[PDB]
Amino acid sequence: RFVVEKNNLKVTSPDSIKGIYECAIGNFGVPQYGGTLVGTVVYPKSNQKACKSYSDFDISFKSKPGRLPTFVLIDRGDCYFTLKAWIAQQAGAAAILVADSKAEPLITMSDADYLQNITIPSALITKTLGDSIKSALSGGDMVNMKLDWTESVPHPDERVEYELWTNSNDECGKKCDTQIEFLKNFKGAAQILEKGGHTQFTPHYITWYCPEAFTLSKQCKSQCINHGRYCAPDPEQDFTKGYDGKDVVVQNLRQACVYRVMNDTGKPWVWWDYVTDFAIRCPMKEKKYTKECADGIIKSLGIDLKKVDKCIGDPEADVENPVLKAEQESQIGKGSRGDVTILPTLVVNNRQYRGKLEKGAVLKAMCSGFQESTEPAICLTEDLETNECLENNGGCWQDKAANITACRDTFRGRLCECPTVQGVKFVGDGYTHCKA
Amino acid sequence: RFVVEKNNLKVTSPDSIKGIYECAIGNFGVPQYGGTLVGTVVYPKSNQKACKSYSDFDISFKSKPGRLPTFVLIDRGDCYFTLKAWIAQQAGAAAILVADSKAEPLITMSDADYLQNITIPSALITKTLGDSIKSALSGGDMVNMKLDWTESVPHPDERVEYELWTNSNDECGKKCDTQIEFLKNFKGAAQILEKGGHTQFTPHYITWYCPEAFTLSKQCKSQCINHGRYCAPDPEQDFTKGYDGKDVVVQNLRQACVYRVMNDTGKPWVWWDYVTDFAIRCPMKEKKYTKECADGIIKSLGIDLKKVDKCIGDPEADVENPVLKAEQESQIGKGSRGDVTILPTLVVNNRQYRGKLEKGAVLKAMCSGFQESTEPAICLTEDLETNECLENNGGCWQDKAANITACRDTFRGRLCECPTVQGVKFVGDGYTHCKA
Amino acid sequence: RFVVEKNNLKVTSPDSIKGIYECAIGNFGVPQYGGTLVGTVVYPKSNQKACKSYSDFDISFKSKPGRLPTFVLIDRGDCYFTLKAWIAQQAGAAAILVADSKAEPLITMSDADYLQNITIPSALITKTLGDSIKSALSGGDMVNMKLDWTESVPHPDERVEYELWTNSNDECGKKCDTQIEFLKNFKGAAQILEKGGHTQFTPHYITWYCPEAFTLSKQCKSQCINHGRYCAPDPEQDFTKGYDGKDVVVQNLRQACVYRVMNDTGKPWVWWDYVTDFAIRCPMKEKKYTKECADGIIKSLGIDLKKVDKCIGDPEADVENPVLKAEQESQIGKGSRGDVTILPTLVVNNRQYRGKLEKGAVLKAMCSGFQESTEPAICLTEDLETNECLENNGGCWQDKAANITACRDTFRGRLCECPTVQGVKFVGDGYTHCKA
Numbered sequence A, B, C: 001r002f003v004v005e006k007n008n009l010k011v012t013s014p015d016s017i018k019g020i021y022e023c024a025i026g027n028f029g030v031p032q033y034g035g036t037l038v039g040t041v042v043y044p045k046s047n048q049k050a051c052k053s054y055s056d057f058d059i060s061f062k063s064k065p066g067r068l069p070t071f072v073l074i075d076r077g078d079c080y081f082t083l084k085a086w087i088a089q090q091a092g093a094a095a096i097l098v099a100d101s102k103a104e105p106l107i108t109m110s111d112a113d114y115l116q117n118i119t120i121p122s123a124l125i126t127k128t129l130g131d132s133i134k135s136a137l138s139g140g141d142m143v144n145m146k147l148d149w150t151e152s153v154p155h156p157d158e159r160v161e162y163e164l165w166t167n168s169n170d171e172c173g174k175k176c177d178t179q180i181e182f183l184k185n186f187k188g189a190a191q192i193l194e195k196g197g198h199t200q201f202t203p204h205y206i207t208w209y210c211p212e213a214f215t216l217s218k219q220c221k222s223q224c225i226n227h228g229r230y231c232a233p234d235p236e237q238d239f240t241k242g243y244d245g246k247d248v249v250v251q252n253l254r255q256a257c258v259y260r261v262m263n264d265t266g267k268p269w270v271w272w273d274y275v276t277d278f279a280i281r282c283p284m285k286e287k288k289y290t291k292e293c294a295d296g297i298i299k300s301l302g303i304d305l306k307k308v309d310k311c312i313g314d315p316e317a318d319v320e321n322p323v324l325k326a327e328q329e330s331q332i333g334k335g336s337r338g339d340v341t342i343l344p345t346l347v348v349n350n351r352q353y354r355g356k357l358e359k360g361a362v363l364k365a366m367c368s369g370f371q372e373s374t375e376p377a378i379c380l381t382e383d384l385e386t387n388e389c390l391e392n393n394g395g396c397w398q399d400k401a402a403n404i405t406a407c408r409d410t411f412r413g414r415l416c417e418c419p420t421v422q423g424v425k426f427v428g429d430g431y432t433h434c435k436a
């Protein structure tokens, strides 16, 4: 239960042992915010194991004004680490320093008890560093130290998982427009949530297969790919002028593949910047609902296109697409979640969501899974901007000769709107170009 | 308990019965957000009434990957509708389709029970449409359908009612200024609240009558109208230079009448745009506290002036004004509310309000009447703008030759401030004109 | 339990007793928001002491439409004031008027009981004014009055106290930058909190003393002042190029002294404007981390410099600094708070704070000490701007010949950024000058 950090521990005196040394800071007993604790150390005579209370041996630390905090050197073993910190904190100790009797610097080894009151930092030091202090304290030399935990303490091992089911269609009416306005408004929140490790978002899509009585029929050719293995209704429903379901299944699988690629590289928030820019740059009315326009966004955001077209695979082949198969399989009820039948469905913590699609409504439902003192900044009724403008200018237009870019980070996420220079509203096509 | 919607139901196959048909979607079991559910239908052999559990007859629906959802055709009668949906949802059904044995398409007919877990959509179809499916399922033809509830589910039948008591005076000190800053700041919130059906606001005003010992005295002539039937103190209290109480009673009755007219047409939020623009365009210091200036706002906002001057009636006649009589009557304690004596008094859900006049304080008090999963967007710590700019340009100045208007929708509501074009701050009188 | 206010009470009739008179409005029974209550008075025959229920003597006040509210004249004594208001409110009275039988106008004299339902205003009037009404009611003359409590009811006697421990160093890494971004972001919230009397903030700083074995050593000369009585580690830790701990102890003591001076004059929020402008105008990289640059901020904000340099005293003398002694003493555990060892430590209501340093996180922790219906505007999820721009232009640059200033009040507090005029972004050194 100790995370190893090298630059955290530093010794100021004695000068013979001065320097930076590695230590394994504890997960509990330290504050979330980063900081610094400077103090001296004391090695007790009795109860060096800290397995019993220090009041029995009449050992107190008695912090006084102007005095350096009293770090305690504890011999590892005979009792749990959390109990050692509790005994020292009762005596008034500022922090504990456990020296493992084992020589391995990497070894780092419970039940929910009354340990939340522990507020003193804990650390595990190498046996070499521990015995170096024991010798300095026996010679009459003070050992003054500095401890910089510094880490904001992410603790994102168990967070909130939300899965959204959407469609890339934009002409089906107000239902499709409500989702786009939601994705554009929720992008800024979801990005900072995933960047802070507070959320794990997985976008999902819905496809069906051609029935056996309709196999090779004309309706199965217009709405389905991979020989009728993955389907979707026609957007316009006119068919003669509509884009047909195939183009929808392709762009859905493309957006799913953009997530499959970015999730492996460690940037799933890029999926949000892709689907929002997809609705802005590649519409169906302008006939820009093509693969060429979609690949332009993939290139503008630095997304790897080879990994995407490989994830997509053959659009027309009797083989099965692994992502669309995993998506149709993801629709089946996996325990308490139940089956996913509705098209705009959101599932938070493996239980579905029926409230309104408002951003604040979705947020208020997600902040219920978080515990107190761990709620993110966004959850605590605080509004913040994104930070995508700093890399590749967010994939927005830019003129370095004038220190002027089309990128702008907002609460809705990065937006590549043409900038206004000297009062002149530049009119251009967002990132592709901008001109007065 | 079913709302009738025509375009919601559509049949894709068989082609002999394809088309859009009317259906009565259920109030419960459907999500608030709008969406689409595409699936096929199944007519059970036993328990067609859905009055008993399907596990007794060993009937399950067994949803599988890639399979269309399983709509169920239930014969109406012998049990309640909510119990039919509960039995099907246990078997894994996606939605139920009740076919009324009665031939009337309009007939649509409990106690609070464990029905909140019902999350499958419910619908009532005509007996013609129901028997058309029974014949298609007996011939061996699949019936694939699409159901678009789509409605955001307003459910505004029982909402929050708040009544505010104000005065149009603007020179009585800081007390009158605190109300105007409140009305200007709360306008944007109250408008979106009433537009979404979440609130019913009624503005109220306070008037007294001349005592019998003071009848026809000079003080009763300055402060009272309708031969001393409705009164108000002098604003300035100097009388010689003050506007006298009569002008206050007239403008109060005028603002009340603006609400009486707009409430009948279905736009009570216009009262907010009127009283805020009244404090901006018709002040007492500029001597614009006249009927002419007030009628200009009535014309700018498209308010019907005939219905207002009829509601006002004769300002000086021994007859009684019905609105001011209903207002003086509205002051009397009608149950738990008690009498309304304080001038800036707010009553929410027929119980008064003592907290501070801050917008967030008034909001937090109103969001207590709303239930969870039904709180409006404004209540859920989300800040949004209004939408009055789209009609008549909100009654603000506009130059179509430059695509430039003086209207601006904000969180405080529509505001007719002069726009800034090309860096040049146009200086003008708001809506009346604007010029660089 | 009555606050004396002169202009609150005014009499309209009879004309022989008309005028403004002093009265002692009650702390309870009145609303927080300011307003006005106009009504007539009634002196009961029996139970003039209001010590028994009015239903026994069959005395009711019976408010009717158009009728003036019924103020009650109660003789002081024989029972508590709160019980008198409760008896009158049951009879339907609008407000009570207690006339002290004692002739002193200043005398104004419990356990938590069921008195929260009391919503009628209460007031204590002089015996002269009380007997003047008794004579007017015996002669058959109506006494019409007006009562303007008006006060927002601050009640800031017992509020939230938060103490923050910071350091003026800006090159120690990200730990020092996290604090500055926090102080810049929290400045706007903390200022409005202290201005409304809702918070008492005391900034604190951490210093140590030179050990006896290190007295007069070179390391004690670089990090410590007053002959090694107050210390701090070197910022850069290089010493050869670092500013040395002495400069840090001096600027910390200077910032503490700026608070010690401003707290006595009644403007502790100026400390926030000082430390934020200190990080903007006097950095260490530009070598502006000098006393001269720091005194410029003291002069720009109108802070009294004599009281600051006196609080600082002799930077190098064997005497002890009273503020730094009170600061080192403030570090010791004073009850439930415990010792303060961590450098960025915040203590709210004498109990420490472990959550993240986010503004919303700190706010949510502070709003827990406030009771309901008394939470400030900032606490109730409402965002507001400051009001420092109105005095000395917030100590920002200004050009009166163009109505253009560099001051701007925001949610982060006053900021002296160069203004943009006619689209031209003026580039200057904030307040010191600004030019296109």
Ligand SMILES: *[C@@H]1O[C@H](CO)[C@@H](O[C@@H]2O[C@H](CO)[C@@H](O[C@@H]3O[C@H](CO)[C@@H](O)[C@H](O[C@H]4O[C@H](CO)[C@@H](O)[C@H](O)[C@@H]4O)[C@@H]3O)[C@H](O)[C@H]2NC(C)=O)[C@H](O)[C@H]1NC(C)=O
Pocket (backbone or CB within 6 Å): A200, A202, A260, A263, A264
């Ligand atoms: C996006 O990429 C992330 C990369 O982190 C990925 O998250 C990872 O998912 C895997 C698979 O779900 C998680 O591994 C699971 O972790 C726990 C803890 O051990 C176990 O419950 C799981 O065991 C399963 O797999 C075992 C295989 O040995 C089986 O024996 C067992 O029966 C279970 O089936 C499983 O190991 C992993 O913890 C996360 N990691 C993080 C950091 O979240 C995510 O799934 C990717 N998403 C998509 C949509 O591709």
Ligand SMILES: *[C@@H]1O[C@H](CO)[C@@H](O[C@@H]2O[C@H](CO)[C@@H](O[C@@H]3O[C@H](CO)[C@@H](O)[C@H](O[C@H]4O[C@H](CO)[C@@H](O)[C@H](O)[C@@H]4O)[C@@H]3O)[C@H](O)[C@H]2NC(C)=O)[C@H](O)[C@H]1NC(C)=O
Pocket (backbone or CB within 6 Å): B200, B202, B260, B263, B264
């Ligand atoms: C602004 O206009 C709206 C228009 O909707 C208006 O709201 C309506 O007010 C009326 C009158 O208060 C409401 O009707 C009431 O509804 C319930 C349900 O039936 C009943 O409690 C009431 O019965 C009363 O009236 C009966 C007359 O037959 C009496 O027999 C009975 O004893 C009661 O006195 C009454 O019918 C109506 O429901 C609302 N409608 C909506 C949609 O809110 C509002 O009052 C107008 N406001 C102003 C200030 O003019």
Ligand SMILES: *[C@@H]1O[C@H](CO)[C@@H](O[C@@H]2O[C@H](CO)[C@@H](O[C@@H]3O[C@H](CO)[C@@H](O)[C@H](O[C@H]4O[C@H](CO)[C@@H](O)[C@H](O)[C@@H]4O)[C@@H]3O)[C@H](O)[C@H]2NC(C)=O)[C@H](O)[C@H]1NC(C)=O
Pocket (backbone or CB within 6 Å): C200, C202, C260, C263, C264
């Ligand atoms: C900033 O200036 C403000 C000015 O208001 C100042 O707040 C005041 O602090 C003093 C000292 O802490 C408070 O006085 C205390 O009040 C209560 C109520 O009576 C008592 O608990 C305290 O008694 C102490 O002092 C007595 C001296 O006679 C002793 O007999 C007793 O044992 C206690 O030690 C004490 O009187 C005062 O109430 C506040 N006032 C306000 C309005 O807050 C604040 O301390 C200054 N801060 C700094 C950092 O300089």
Ligand SMILES: *[C@@H]1O[C@H](CO)[C@@H](O)[C@H](O)[C@H]1NC(C)=O
Pocket (backbone or CB within 6 Å): A116, A117
């Ligand atoms: C310990 O933390 C718990 C949290 O449940 C709290 O109730 C308790 O008062 C704390 N006790 C001490 C001594 O800090």
Ligand SMILES: *[C@@H]1O[C@H](CO)[C@@H](O)[C@H](O)[C@H]1NC(C)=O
Pocket (backbone or CB within 6 Å): A403
């Ligand atoms: C361009 O703008 C960036 C972003 O602030 C800034 O760091 C950089 O110095 C600027 N370059 C110029 C003004 O030449």
Ligand SMILES: *[C@@H]1O[C@H](CO)[C@@H](O)[C@H](O)[C@H]1NC(C)=O
Pocket (backbone or CB within 6 Å): B116, B117
């Ligand atoms: C049904 O809803 C209630 C709401 O009170 C909830 O407590 C319960 O867990 C739900 N049960 C199921 C099976 O969904």
Ligand SMILES: *[C@@H]1O[C@H](CO)[C@@H](O)[C@H](O)[C@H]1NC(C)=O
Pocket (backbone or CB within 6 Å): B403
């Ligand atoms: C005027 O502005 C409106 C509002 O955006 C826009 O719809 C319209 O096309 C504009 N007309 C022009 C630029 O001629």
Ligand SMILES: *[C@@H]1O[C@H](CO)[C@@H](O)[C@H](O)[C@H]1NC(C)=O
Pocket (backbone or CB within 6 Å): C116, C117
């Ligand atoms: C009095 O106030 C209390 C607050 O605890 C409330 O519960 C109660 O209903 C109120 N009673 C009346 C009669 O207003």
Ligand SMILES: *[C@@H]1O[C@H](CO)[C@@H](O)[C@H](O)[C@H]1NC(C)=O
Pocket (backbone or CB within 6 Å): C403
């Ligand atoms: C300067 O600006 C102030 C702040 O609004 C204003 O009160 C004043 O009238 C202005 N003076 C001018 C425009 O001469």
